[PDB]
């Protein structure tokens, strides 16, 4: 989940 927590 490396896209702003998602």
């Amino acid at each position, epitope marked *: 989940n*490396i*896209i*702003x*927590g*998602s």
Partner: antibody
Amino acid sequence: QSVKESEGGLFKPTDTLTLTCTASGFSLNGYGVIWVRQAPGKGLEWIGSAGAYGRIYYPNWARSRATITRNTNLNTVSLKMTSLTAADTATYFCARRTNVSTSVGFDSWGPGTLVTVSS
Amino acid sequence: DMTQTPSSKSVPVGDTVTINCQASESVYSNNRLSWFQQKPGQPPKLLIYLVSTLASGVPSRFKGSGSGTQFTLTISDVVCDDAATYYCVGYKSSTTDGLAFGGGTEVVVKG
């Protein structure tokens, strides 16, 4: 609806720089916050980012000497940098991103705070 | 790694200028790319987010385009007010080295 960096000023080499990003008219909690600096006559340089959902990420050069912390109680984001040199003399900016969906659509920029590390 | 070329470009008033931005690796979802305008002594200003969407209050003579590893900012009908340095910022992830700033392109307007 603006962000502001705390006071910089005069530092000796080997000092520690501590800066706080404060918001007025909206919130920093839940929004991405970035730290950028600009040495005299040079380009913008990323220092690190406070993700909107808790993750803190840096460029490699900064990961050893910079640490970035969020305070959701006080609605602030802070930057601490160790082992200062004259090369760290620059204007330091913080900025807020309204929409996470843009990732780097950084919207509200502070006026910048001047940091002089004098040899 | 974002490479911006050229470092500097002079453009006559009224002409069109194009600023190039080379991402060594494609930005996330092919669209995490923003453009900024900075005049000396001032904070940066957001011009375009998501490759081509203009920020509010930005005139339509600014045009962002590109995809993958290559992006362009086009300023038509250049005025002296456009004298500034322009930056692209690309995002890949929320990790180490996971966003990058271009080195900037200084636009000198010839009056």
